[PDB]
């Protein structure tokens, strides 16, 4: 259900308009109330990155073909292959022990060169996020109830990005509406890439990807650089060199990628990346009219963890608590050192954890201190308590 605006959330002017200020989270709904008017439901539908530019490809599976060698006796000059001039080739120049036993008129170091065609079988793609183009869609519609004549209850879909924070819609009764909003992301994209590997995509640290000891290719394509990571030239004997491709490094990457958060790619667009977290702070501008705020009692009755506190990946902890008998009420949440004094020392990420009706399951996100702490939901004897260690 949607959660009703409190009195302080909106402000009505003597002249001009009325302004609502709200923080929109995903999978949650905020409603604006007005006397003898259908309630106005506003919700954050999605936050997305649309077609991020490719910054780098990192090869973890390489295959060698067309291996060619050339050799020269000592003091006859430098040995060369035409393939030395081709970027798709991995080459090495060295010298082997030559003499009478292998077709040379004098003992010594003979020039030997070896090239092989480098094709990357499997690579990880790294995408750069343009933070000024992170998109978000806000859905707004009058609360569907019994049919009222001349009331428009059409859904209004408002498309934003970081640059275009001001969009417009219109409702009956409420009139014209100007929404001025901003995105706050849950992870720092300035320090991050979106990494695509086969079916899957994660959000990874940039420096981690840069420090990978693997061949890479620039965003503007071209040749594969530092091929030597996956190409081995064994020491030469006579007039040959063994040229081997190293093994697939898929396991290393996948192992390292466990300690990294995933990102969902869209189902029917299949080019979008939709983020799970984030806040969207909005000022909604309406023409002057009366709104009805709702007061909220604090949850007193016994609650329960529908889902126990668990790590989210990006430093925060998510829980889901059920409110069986408390009615509509705000869930008191703190994070303390002990159960006695209970002085809050954590950061409540969730904006107003409120259960609309009884038997309703509510998400609560919290940022606990480093070390040992107690996540405390509710107050009094039936309060929920969950120990936690962060590092």
């Amino acid at each position, epitope marked *: 259900h949607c959660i009703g605006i409190t009195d302080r959330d909106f402000i009505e002017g003597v002249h001009g308009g009325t302004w609502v200020s709200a923080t929109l989270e995903q999978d949650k709904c905020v409603t604006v109330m007005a006397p003898d008017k259908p309630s106005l439901d506003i919700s954050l539908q999605t936050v997305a990155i649309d077609g991020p530019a490719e910054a780098r490809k990192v090869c973890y599976s390489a295959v060698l073909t*067309h291996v060619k060698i050339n050799d020269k006796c000592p003091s006859t000059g430098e*040995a060369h292959l035409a393939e030395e001039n*081709d970027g798709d080739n991995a080459c090495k120049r060295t010298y082997s022990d030559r003499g009478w036993g292998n077709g040379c008129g004098l003992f010594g170091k003979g020039s030997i060169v070896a090239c092989a*065609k480098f094709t990357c079988a499997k690579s990880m793609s790294l995408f750069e996020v343009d933070q000024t183009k992170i998109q978000y869609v806000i859905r707004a519609q009058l609360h569907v109830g019994a049919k009222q004549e001349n009331w428009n209850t059409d859904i209004k879909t408002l498309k934003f990005d970081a640059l275009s924070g001001s969009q417009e819609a219109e409702f009956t009764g409420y009139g014209k509406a100007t929404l001025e909003c901003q995105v706050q992301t849950a992870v720092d994209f300035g320090n991050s890439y979106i990494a695509e590997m086969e079916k899957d995509s994660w959000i990874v640290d940039r420096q981690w990807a840069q420090d990978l000891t693997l061949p890479w290719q620039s965003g503007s394509g071209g040749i594969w650089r530092e091929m030597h990571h996956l190409v081995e030239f064994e020491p030469p004997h*006579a007039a*040959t060199i063994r*040229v081997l491709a190293l093994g697939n490094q898929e396991g290393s990457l996948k192992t390292a990628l466990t300690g990294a958060m995933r990102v969902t790619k869209d189902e029917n667009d299949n080019n979008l990346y939709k983020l799970h977290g984030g806040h969207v702070s909005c000022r909604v501008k309406l023409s002057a009219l009366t709104l009805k705020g709702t007061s909220y009692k604090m949850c007193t009755d016994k609650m329960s963890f529908v889902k126990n506190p668990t790590d989210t990946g990006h430093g925060t902890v998510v829980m889901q608590v059920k409110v069986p008998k408390g009615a509509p009420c705000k869930i008191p949440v703190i994070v303390a050192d002990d159960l006695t004094a209970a002085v809050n020392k954590g950061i409540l990420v969730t904006v107003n954890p409120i259960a609309s009706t009884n038997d309703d399951e509510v998400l609560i996100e919290v940022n606990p201190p480093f070390g040992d702490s107690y996540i405390i939901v509710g107050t009094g004897d039936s309060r929920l308590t969950y120990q936690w260690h962060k590092e």
Partner: antibody
Amino acid sequence: EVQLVESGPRLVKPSETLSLTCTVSGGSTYNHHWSWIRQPPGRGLEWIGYISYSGKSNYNPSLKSRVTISLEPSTTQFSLKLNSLTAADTAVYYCAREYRDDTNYYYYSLDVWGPGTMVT
Amino acid sequence: IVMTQSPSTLSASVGDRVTITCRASQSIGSWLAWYQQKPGKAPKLLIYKASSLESGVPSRFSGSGSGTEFTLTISSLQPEDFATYYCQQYNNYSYTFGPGTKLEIK
């Protein structure tokens, strides 16, 4: 840059011997199978034969009786010698390298050729 | 081992997709090479081991087949491509060339 050049008597009389010499530059002749191939004017290609640094050789069965191919590694060159010459031997003669790599197992057949010389 | 080719001659224009066939008397596995030759010039290696391109042969050229029957294919014919194409087995000695397939202009 490996290159081959064939030279010798362009004019030969019948019943004679034929001495052609292929010179290899840009690489040693320790590896690979050094070969001779010919092509009569307007007709197709005929593989004559090869010799290797080891001394192992092979000749086309239709020619084996008259054909000798020798290898001198000292100057990196190999020779073709044909005896009992006839008019059916009037041909363009190419020397070529059969590339063989027994370490990484790559075999490109005849990858480097000479321009060839016309023998009448 | 005896090699044969079909057709003996082919007439095509620029842009045409063409296919030439090579056949060995017995199984030669994948040990077949394709050569391109122009008048007054030495043969040039285009394909090795049945289906691998020499560097740097244009990728419009392809080869396929194993054992007995082989095919060379040019997806989009070009002015350069007009020439005589010889096949050659090199499974065993003596190495054998095909009689060749001439490709000329329409």
